[PDB]
Amino acid sequence: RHNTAKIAVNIAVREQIEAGVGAWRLVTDYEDQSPTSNNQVIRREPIHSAC
Amino acid sequence: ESILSRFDADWTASDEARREAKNDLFFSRVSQWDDWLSQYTTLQYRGQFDVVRPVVRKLVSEMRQNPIDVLYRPKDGARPDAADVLMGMYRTDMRHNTAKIAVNIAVREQIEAGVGAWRLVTDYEDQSPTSNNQVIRREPIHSACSHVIWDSNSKLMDKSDARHCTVIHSMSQNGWEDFAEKYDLDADDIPSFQNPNDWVFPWLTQDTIQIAEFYEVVEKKETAFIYQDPVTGEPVSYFKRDIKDVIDDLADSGFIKIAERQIKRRRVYKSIITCTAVLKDKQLIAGEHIPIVPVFGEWGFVEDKEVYEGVVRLTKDGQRLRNMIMSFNADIVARTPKKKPFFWPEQIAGFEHMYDGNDDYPYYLLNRTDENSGDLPTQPLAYYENPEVPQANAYMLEAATSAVKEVATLGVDTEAVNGGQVAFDTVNQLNMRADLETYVFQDNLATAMRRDGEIYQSIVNDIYDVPRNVTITLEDGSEKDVQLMAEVVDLATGEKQVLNDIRGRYECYTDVGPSFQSMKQQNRAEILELLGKTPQGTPEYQLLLLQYFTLLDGKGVEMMRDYANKQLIQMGVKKPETPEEQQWL
């Protein structure tokens, strides 16, 4: 459903050279985006400018 | 009103305008027009200098592999012959399209002219045939660089929800086009909009025309179905539930349920949040959301004010004083007061005809006499002597000429291994799904494939049950012809206009990858290198001949799919989709 992470992997690996590492964003807990049997995976993503 | 929320923060745009936003035009100011910055004590004439195309120009010619023609990912939800409701819908490529260039405008839009906003088909079709089979068009917008500011989502967008910043489309004195279906009388709504064109007021061209009223703002929704507290009267009956771990069967603890969630919304109306007002109502539309989405490149930002994604101008070092040559020569070819050969011209310039080029050149009265002096070597050497005779530009001309040792060295390779995919391409493929993503994840009301709903014809099941005498059919040739005449049926009937998010009606998901267009393209990988694919032997007799057709589904040869009927039946493989007909024998 999501084959590749477009910019998320790109700036994350470059930022750690540029600045100190940050956090990694995710949907908190459950039952908001597309709840159902099967159907549940949330793709990787860094946090917002907390680095 | 009492709360300034959406407006007050929107007064901040012009607060940084005097610093970042008025000079944020750099993209088009370095790419075109005038970069004038620090100048003082100057004269006018200057200002066509184009060295910036070499860096910007190859990126639009960079990659021809962006179009990525790809076909038909299947899945396990519905088998490929269960897709029968569409057929040739998007098999058409796209409609007859002005937008085949539009995506090519979008791929350079990471900055270019400040990122534009994307536009799709405000309302339904004017042309109304049957057998819908609907393809479509797209356009972005121009300008709108720093004039629009986006704090919304900006990170992971599948746009499963319709939250948008501002959607209404036009700018012009005919821009009142946008509402042509709507109210549309005198255009009297009188807003005040966004005029940051730096003005000392020498000259002209300010127009106030803009149509902006917010559309859909901050949707917030909670469901967590089928759990509640039925008794005691319930002040603000609805409440919030998240964690589900340890619950088990409570059914006998009390009331039965058999309940569904009717959408419960009274949204306190700030009414489209127009600083002035909106004069019309009833924006509630159909099933799911509005198909329009944004178009987006790579994202990065730091703090309050920034400058983003340097590509165009890396040479800003030498761009400044390499034009001091204008002051070297063009200044001194002007200012010169009479380069002079002073030998014995103490009186110098005589009567007119001397400098008119009269007759022949020899001159008159070069004379010398001196009163009490004494004579020693007076030596008039000075012709104004020497220009700056630049030396270091046998050196420094190359540094302003070449910073590309640091720049153009990016992606050194020719072809074959070590491909040329760069960060520009890798993020843009998620735009192409707009040809499809817009039509699918939305639920929408009736396409009315056959006789609208016609939910069940099952009534016909009433006529056949025959207890008294029944016999099996005696040997059957002749009239039966095509089968399916009603005898006994269990149809697995249910399909509804809005089937909400449920699987089995879904179409296709993201196929993105390299340029492979799938009918067996990567099993034989051609490119420029490998050769031997499927050599001769027993396996190829059943492999390359029947299975490999570069002609796709083409009907120019009907013996493509005709192998199976009278020849291979003893082996038992067929490979049509088996729509219609059979054998005689």
UniProtKB/Swiss-Prot annotation, chain A:
Forms the portal vertex of the capsid. This portal plays critical roles in head assembly, genome packaging, neck/tail attachment, and genome ejection. Procapsid assembly may initiate with a nucleation complex composed of portal and scaffolding proteins. The portal protein multimerizes as a single ring-shaped homododecamer arranged around a central channel. Switches upon genome packaging from an asymmetrical conformation in the procapsid (PC-portal) to a symmetrical ring in the mature capsid (MV-portal). This change of conformation may serve as a signal for headful packaging. It comes from Salmonella phage P22. The chain holds residues 103 to 153 of 725 of the full protein. Homododecamer. Interacts with the terminase large subunit; this interaction allows the packaging of viral DNA. Interacts (via C-terminus) with the head-to-tail adapter protein gp4; this interaction participates in the head completion. Interacts with the scaffolding protein; this interaction initiates procapsid assembly, thereby ensuring incorporation of only one portal ring per capsid. Interacts with the capsid protein. Belongs to the p22likevirus portal protein family. It is found in: Virion. Coiled coil: none annotated. This is Portal protein.
